Each structure stands twice: as C-alpha cells, then as structure tokens.
Design a protein around this nucleic acid. Structure first.
Ligand SMILES: [Mg+2]
Ligand SMILES: [Mg+2]
Lengths: 239, 239
DNA sequence: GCCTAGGTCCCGTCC
DNA sequence: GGACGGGGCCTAGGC
C-alpha cells in the first residue's frame, strides 16, 4: 500500500476516485495535471475556461490551481477549506469555505495524471532580514539611529494605529520610528505621518517621526520633507 | 514533443537530468516530489532543513516550493529566473534572478517523483467584484454616491499619490473618493486623508473626501470621523 | 471572531 | 526603468 508516492497517468474514473478519496482521507498531498474549467464564488467571483493546469490539495485544505505562468495560483482556496470529489458529466473537485462562504469548483475534463504524495516535513523556515530583526538591532544598538536615542516600546499601540518603535532622543522628545525592510514608499510616510499627528496631540510639537529604511522613493522623500520628518538610512541585518 | 505527461518515480540521476532538461527546453511544467534542503539568499536570507516538498518550476521562470501546509510556497522565485540543475554530491536545482540579485538553491536529497507536464492553456481568468468594477459603477451611475455628483477622473495622479476617483459635487466642492472592495481599514483612511490634504493646498477649504466601501473597521470609522471625512456604503458589483 | 500591519509580498499600470 | 496602489491578497500577532 504505502510508499511516499502513488501515480497514475491517464486514469480511469474508478482510479481517479480511488486515489483522490484516498488522499483526502490519508491527509496527504493530492497533485493532479488536467484539462479543466474553474468556477469560483466567494468574496469575488471568477470564471476560467478550458485549459491544462496543475492542481494541488494540501492536507490542511489549501487548494491551488496553477497555470503555466506567474507565481500566484489562478484560483485557490486558503487553509481550512473542505474538499469533496463529485461525479457528474465530468468529475468535479469542489472546495467549500465557511466564514466567509466561498466555493471553488474545478471541473475535470481530462485528467492526465493523479498522484498522492505522502509527505513528511518536520522542519520549518528560518528567515533573517525581517523588519522585526531591524527592531531587534535598534533596541540592542540605538546609535544606528542617532546618538542618545532611547528605544522604549515596540509595536506600541497609540490611540489609533500601532507604531513600530517608540522612544526618546537626547532632547527628551517623543520619537516615532516606522521601519521598512526595503525601499520605503508613500504609504510608509503616510503611516509615520499618521502616528506623529496623533502623538502631537498628547505630547505637542516636540515629536519627531523618523523613517528608517534602506532607501526612499522620490515621492516618499518629497512627502517626508514636506511634513518635516526625518530619514535614517538603515539596512535590515542578516544573521 | 511527446505525450502530454512524463513521470518517473525514484529516478536515477540520468533520468532526473533528462526530464528536467526536457522540461526547460520544451516550455513545460516541471514537478518534483522530493526530500530536500532549501537555501535562499537575496532580498532576504532563509534556510529550510531536510524535508518532503512539492517543487514546481514554471516555464516563465517561476519557482515554487510547497510544504504540506498553508497557501504559500515556503520558498520561491518570481518570473524571470534562470533555473538549472547542478550536480554536487546531490543534485541541486538553482534558480537565479538579477535585479535584484537573488539565489534559490534546492538540494534534492531523495527524489521520489519527477514529472514533465506539457501544459496547453490559452484561457485567461475572468473576475468580477473588483475595485475597478466599483469605479465603473460610479461612472455609469454617479448617483450611487450622491445626487448631482459629477465624476471626472479615474486613477488620477495628484501631486503626491494617485486618487481613485476624483470629481465634484452639486454644491461645487471638489470630491475625492477612496474605494475599497472589502471592509475598509486604517490604511484606506490614511490614503483618503492624505489626498484630501494635498488637494486642499490648491483648492483650499472646499474639498471632501469620501470613503466608499461595504464597511469600515473600528479604527477606520474612528479616524474617519475624527478628521471629518465621509463614508458611503457600497458593495462591489458582480457581473 | 476583529483589528492592524508586514511580506523575499506579487502584479498591473502608467510615467 | 521607478513608482504607486490593488489583491478573492496571505499570514502572524493582539485582543
Ligand atoms: Mg509599522
Ligand atoms: Mg486607492
């Protein structure tokens, strides 16, 4: 019975059903290559005409449909969904999501391959260069901002919003940082500017916003300078 | 070049190479089930220990590595990545991208299955329920906003930023619309307020922002009201 | 559950 | 090319 992989090319309906249902029940990865048509209804609504795609169903209920291009799936369902195979004029893979109600229907016109991959993964990703690690860097070593900077809070909620880092300078002013792990764009400045306005209410005009990022878009620089805010160039560190 | 699909389970290196080669050469989809390690250096840095994953290489250079959970590849590479297979003491898939420089390395420790799928797809997705369709609604039916509302511009760049819908109202003010296809968050109110400020600079005190969306989060309504902006409930249309 | 914000975001678009 | 903002965003962290 059980090897990591079970493949059948150009399978019978009996074989299809056999494997598909076995995948769902054994909680393993179903992969399929097929000519299909897709029907999605949910937050938005979509239609995809006949063509060959890859289809993946994870044991956690995530459902992917990949065309020959891009990175993103053309259609999907996120983890937690429930899938059932339905026999009709053609077999149909059907994933239902509750909360929000969403339906994905993959009509299988021709199945070129069905497979069951019983995959064992105990390892999880280890990633460095996050903005969280920027914050770790700053709290360990505040001078990367400027002399006498005193970081105090992280992900601190002010009244409306949550600021990346809140602290004080050598003059005793409230200081806001918004951090970005890549070049900072207009929404970055809008974030900072938003937090500073709100802080100016309690603490007055003392308050300095600083954008901390490796670089800055032209439009970000403009809006920064128009609003009298500051920029510290900082690269996110790699372990 | 051959049948739609080729599959080899527990391939030899010669078989593995043969297939991978054919895939890249034929603009097919490469699919691998394998025990592997993944190393990524680029915009960020990551490491992933030995484990079973589904690996996909699309002919447009897209590179997906999927574990048994979530919707998201654990590691990946967007279109325009040269992939190739180097033989170290294990075969390694190597995907490189420039601008920015990024290296993805998948060390195939045990390949359980390799497959070449010459997928044929001429169909593009049709989706409805989007921000753009809200916009269209508003232009062909301005009264969904308010009576005597005249829409003028769509995706119109003002000095700093790009407004969703720009227009005028019956009493002669300039109106800014920010649209969201789903419940609106702080991010959207910051966008709106930002735009309104900038347009106040030319046209002074007569400017209205209106956030148009099916609903607001708590902070969104909080901040909306505080800065004296307006809301119209609207649901994206599904055609 | 809702809210808030990041992401190796991807991706389209228009300058 | 850089830049700006949507997405069925997803996903993680508070609460
Ligand atoms: Mg932040
Ligand atoms: Mg907008």
């Amino acid at each position: 019975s059980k090897d990591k992989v079970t493949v059948i090319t150009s399978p019978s309906t009996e074989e299809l059903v056999s494997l598909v249902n076995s995948a769902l029940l054994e909680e393993a990865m179903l992969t399929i290559f097929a000519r299909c048509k897709v029907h999605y209804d949910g937050r938005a609504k979509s239609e995809l005409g006949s063509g060959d795609r890859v289809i993946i169903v994870k044991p956690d209920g995530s459902f992917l449909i990949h065309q020959s291009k891009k990175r993103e799936p053309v259609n999907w369902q996120p983890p937690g969904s429930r899938v059932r195979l339905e026999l009709r004029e053609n077999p149909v893979l059907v994933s239902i999501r509750r909360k929000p109600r969403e339906t994905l229907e993959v009509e299988l016109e021709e199945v070129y391959m069905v497979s069951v991959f019983r995959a064992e993964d105990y390892e999880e990703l280890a990633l460095t260069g996050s903005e969280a690690e920027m914050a770790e860097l700053i709290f360990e070593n505040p001078e990367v901002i400027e002399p006498g900077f005193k970081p105090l809070f992280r992900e601190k909620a002010i009244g409306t919003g949550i600021v990346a880092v809140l602290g004080r300078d050598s003059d005793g002013n409230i200081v806001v940082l918004e951090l970005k792990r890549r070049r900072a764009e207009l929404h970055a400045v809008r974030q900072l500017k938003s937090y500073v306005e709100i802080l100016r209410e309690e603490y007055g005009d003392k308050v300095r916003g600083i954008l901390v990022a490796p670089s800055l878009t032209s439009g970000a620089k403009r809006l920064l300078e128009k609003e009298g805010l500051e920029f510290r160039k900082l690269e996110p560190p790699k372990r």
